Amino acid sequence: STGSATTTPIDSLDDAYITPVQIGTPAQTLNLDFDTGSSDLWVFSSETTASEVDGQTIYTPSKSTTAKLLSGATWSISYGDGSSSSGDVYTDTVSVGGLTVTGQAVESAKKVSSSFTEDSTIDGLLGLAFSTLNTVSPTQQKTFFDNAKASLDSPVFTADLGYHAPGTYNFGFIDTTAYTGSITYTAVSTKQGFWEWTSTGYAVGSGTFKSTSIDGIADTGTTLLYLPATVVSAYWAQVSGAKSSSSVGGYVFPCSATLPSFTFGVGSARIVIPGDYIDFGPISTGSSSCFGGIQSSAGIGINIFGDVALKAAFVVFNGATTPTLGFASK
């Protein structure tokens, strides 16, 4: 089997991407944030505290003939940005882009934090990291990908995120028309439950490539690119007037600037992030101070190849017995 679904930015800054997902019978379609940095499929639901719902589409298990309460199971998750959600669990049929899993754990939110309530465009998350991170207790549950894997033509999914445009998540096949040149594969460590890999270095604009190992995670659920302070300082030093602002919470730059590209290494290959991808616009409406798309990972504890990086590439998440990550230009 295979699946193929279009993923669409939620706003003009590509802050996140939503992908339609069919849950239950008859289908209830919810727009979920596919997140390669977590491992819970959770949804706004008929059980979500009413004051914490503001425009989202909800999953109503009582209207699904295939929903079954997973008795005794609860979940609770906290994300890197400080947001959180929790609730109980149903199993139900879940389909993505024509690919169907029966018996998928669908985690129903009783509570969500303010950032979720305030984002009316995101109806939940679909985690695509390793199932060892799943938060369901007392019986840990498998991700949609883990459950689908045996049925898939090939045990892979791919992320092809757009810059200010729709893109695609494919399951079970590699679309050889979706990228240019060749795909370069690189080793993955699952030791922390993430798609964790080591970049071979970086360049700023037309500068020379610096060979240096940068361990980090491929995380479609994080907006920006978070790298070591040394790397980030080297980048922003090439932008006149750029500075780190503790009041704003990261590097800002004059909106009149032209940003240089940023290149990262994948083995001997190079992925180039155009300067425009690194512009996250005015810090507040009407401001001439703009927020940078490359920020320091210092104090996160991990480097994160978020959407800013991933959208510059066609990315293969290979879930074979020995997992790997592939990157191609596009």
Side-chain angles (χ1 to χ4, degrees), residues 1-62 64-67 69-109 112-141 143-148 150-190 192-242 244-330:
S1 65
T2 61
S4 182
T6 297
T7 193
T8 303
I10 64 165
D11 63 24
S12 67
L13 300 178
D14 296 348
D15 280 315
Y17 298 76
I18 49 170
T19 308
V21 177
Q22 283 71 46
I23 310 174
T25 308
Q28 301 181 37
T29 298
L30 276 64
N31 295 329
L32 305 188
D33 184 351
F34 284 24
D35 182 13
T36 62
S38 69
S39 305
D40 286 51
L41 193 176
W42 74 260
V43 298
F44 278 79
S45 75
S46 54
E47 298 178 334
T48 310
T49 302
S51 65
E52 296 182 349
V53 185
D54 188 8
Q56 295 80 11
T57 294
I58 63 168
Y59 168 60
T60 303
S62 67
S64 174
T65 58
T66 45
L69 182 72
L70 186 61
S71 186
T74 58
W75 62 279
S76 181
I77 192 163
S78 297
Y79 296 101
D81 67 354
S83 67
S84 65
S85 51
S86 63
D88 55 19
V89 187
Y90 292 81
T91 55
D92 208 340
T93 302
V94 172
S95 304
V96 176
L99 170 66
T100 299
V101 170
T102 59
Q104 175 64 45
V106 177
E107 301 172 33
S108 169
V112 304
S113 67
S114 59
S115 55
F116 289 114
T117 299
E118 293 164 359
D119 192 348
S120 65
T121 69
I122 291 174
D123 302 325
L125 266 67
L126 189 150
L128 292 169
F130 294 87
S131 294
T132 52
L133 294 181
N134 175 267
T135 76
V136 176
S137 177
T139 308
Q140 191 170 59
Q141 299 296 302
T143 71
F144 174 82
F145 177 54
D146 205 340
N147 281 323
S151 303
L152 296 178
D153 290 359
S154 177
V156 306
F157 68 89
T158 65
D160 182 9
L161 303 178
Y163 169 66
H164 293 169
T168 306
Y169 283 101
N170 290 329
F171 291 85
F173 72 106
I174 289 161
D175 182 356
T176 61
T177 74
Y179 58 87
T180 57
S182 55
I183 305 174
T184 298
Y185 291 86
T186 195
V188 164
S189 174
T190 64
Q192 292 190 86
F194 300 118
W195 291 94
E196 185 174 3
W197 64 290
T198 302
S199 172
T200 48
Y202 71 100
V204 177
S206 61
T208 61
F209 186 85
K210 175 76 170 179
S211 297
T212 186
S213 291
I214 304 167
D215 295 340
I217 67 167
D219 184 359
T220 58
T222 291
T223 312
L224 304 186
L225 174 52
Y226 294 89
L227 293 173
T230 48
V231 179
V232 177
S233 184
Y235 178 81
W236 290 109
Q238 297 306 309
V239 181
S240 178
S244 182
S245 167
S246 51
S247 57
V248 176
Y251 281 89
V252 295
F253 67 94
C255 293
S256 64
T258 299
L259 298 178
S261 64
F262 184 89
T263 301
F264 65 94
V266 184
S268 62
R270 306 289 181 254
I271 300 295
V272 181
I273 305 171
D276 289 343
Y277 290 24
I278 298 161
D279 175 22
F280 277 74
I283 62 173
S284 293
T285 303
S287 180
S288 67
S289 178
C290 275
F291 197 71
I294 295 175
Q295 297 292 344
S296 175
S297 66
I300 292 176
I302 196 154
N303 300 305
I304 307 175
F305 293 87
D307 297 333
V308 162
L310 304 181
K311 75 179 75 171
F314 176 86
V315 186
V316 179
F317 295 79
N318 171 29
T321 305
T322 299
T324 64
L325 272 174
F327 291 82
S329 296
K330 66 186 185 189

